[PDB]
């Protein structure tokens, strides 16, 4: 088309001019600070809505909140909840069995939405990997231990989230 | 090109013996046809100047066990030329082969394989009609209503044979059917 433009195209092809810009901006990131988190001393951010390990809660008196209404069992998309219930010795409507198969569960939070007494929740814990499949078959006593261990954070998160739900 | 024009023009122009039922609704314009006219109807809709239905969006089966022809095969189609959608349906049973439309829409190839895999409906002149989704050697057609949700067989590693093998199913906790009706 023209000697100047043909020359400029030839030089650019021969001298790899466009390859230089990639090298340069790769080198620019070399000196910038890194985004890596120093786990486990440092952690990623999470929200009060985070759906982690389920837990069963009690009233401050020590009484269980769960009244075996079986709504969570009905709504559970994965059929991971198994409940048995009967009249307790004092006449209370209470679970004798409350199992969640942590390997069926999809961690959707539907059970927490369905529960009319804030008994079952997905708490903030996400670090509960195990060495056996049987340790992931949570029974009622394990869920209540989870609730006792995480109660203060769960209550704080519930106070925060009560203004949206 | 709105759904009032398509309904009226198709009534005026299509050969009468092709369409048994015509529905006009906000849920979609719908044409029902006998199996022996499905191919010609689709070719007409694709080629005709005032329809130009060039895209076959999908083919799917629906099982109706209470019907003599239990399967209903649904063709969802699109005209990018006229920005319109058309649904064409025909019924079928377990042994009656229906015409393939691969020669009209190459996209039909896999959708037909899927209908055969899931429901057991066969397609005449389909170049390569074999199962596409299920495991090799699968028996039955899983989307039929009478096919059980968990099926009939499961697999596990068998150390004595040094291989994965199939056995009749055994469920630790059976699927619980909650009848809220």
């Amino acid at each position: 088309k023209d000697w100047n433009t043909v020359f400029e195209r030839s030089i650019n092809t021969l001298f790899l001019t466009e390859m230089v810009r990639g090298l340069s901006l790769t080198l620019k990131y070399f000196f910038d600070p890194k985004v890596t988190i120093n786990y486990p001393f440092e952690k990623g951010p999470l929200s009060p809505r985070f759906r982690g390990e389920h837990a069963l809660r009690r009233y401050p008196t020590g009484e269980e909140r769960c009244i075996a209404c079986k709504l969570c069992e009905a709504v559970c998309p994965a059929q991971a909840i198994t409940i048995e219930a009967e009249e307790r010795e004092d006449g209370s409507r209470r679970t004798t069995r409350y199992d969640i198969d942590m390997t069926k569960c999809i961690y959707c939070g539907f059970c927490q939405e369905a529960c009319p007494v804030d008994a079952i929740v997905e708490g903030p814990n996400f670090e509960f990997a195990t060495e056996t499949h049987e340790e992931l078959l949570y029974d009622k006593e394990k869920l209540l231990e989870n609730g006792d261990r995480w109660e203060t954070e769960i209550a704080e998160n519930l106070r925060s989230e009560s203004l949206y739900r | 090109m709105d759904n009032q024009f398509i309904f009226k023009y198709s009534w005026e122009t299509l050969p009468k013996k092709w369409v048994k039922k015509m529905e006009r609704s906000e849920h979609g314009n719908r044409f029902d046809t006998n199996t022996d006219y499905l191919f010609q109807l689709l070719c007409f809709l694709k080629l005709h100047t005032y329809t130009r239905v060039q895209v076959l969006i999908d083919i799917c089966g629906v099982d109706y066990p209470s019907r003599k022809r239990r399967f209903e095969v649904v063709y969802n189609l699109l005209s990018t030329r006229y920005n319109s959608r058309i649904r064409v349906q025909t019924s079928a049973d377990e042994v009656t082969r229906i015409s393939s439309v691969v020669s009209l829409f190459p996209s039909a190839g896999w959708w037909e394989r899927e209908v055969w895999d899931m429901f057991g409906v066969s397609f005449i002149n389909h170049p390569d009609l074999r199962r596409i989704l299920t495991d090799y050697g699968f028996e039955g057609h899983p989307l039929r209503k009478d096919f059980p949700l968990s099926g009939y067989v499961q697999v596990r590693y068998d150390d004595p044979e040094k291989r994965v093998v199939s056995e009749p199913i055994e469920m630790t906790q059976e699927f619980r059917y909650f009848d809220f009706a």
Partner: protein, 157 residues
Amino acid sequence: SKAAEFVISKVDDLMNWARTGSIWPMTFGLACCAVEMMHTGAARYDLDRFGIIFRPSPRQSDCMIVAGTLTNKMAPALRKVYDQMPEPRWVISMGSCANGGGYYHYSYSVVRGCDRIVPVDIYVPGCPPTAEALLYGLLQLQKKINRRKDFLHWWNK
């Protein structure tokens, strides 16, 4: 044997240090869990910094991460790949699908847990587990590797 046991324990500590410091997983990226696994290997969590390098061939791998749903059609492929892994080797089951079939448990086409096909060392719960949850699972694997006493068991055999 007041001197042999000390040297043996030192040898075993060295072996465990080497094996925990260089874990080369092969990823079986089956479904959504593979995306969180990709995030674990990305810049924010940087599995490289723990010595964890992902390998393409089972022949250069020490660990298999099963990340996603395992179908009946895929199970023979998973088992064959596991059988090509040289010893010592470990398996991490990631996510509900790999753990016990998850949302697909009752399906006609799904293996109800990859531990029906291969022995599993660590189960990482979640659907999907967060990238940090996978990192925690890998640290649990290190903990398990650090109980090995291969040299001591062989000396006594």
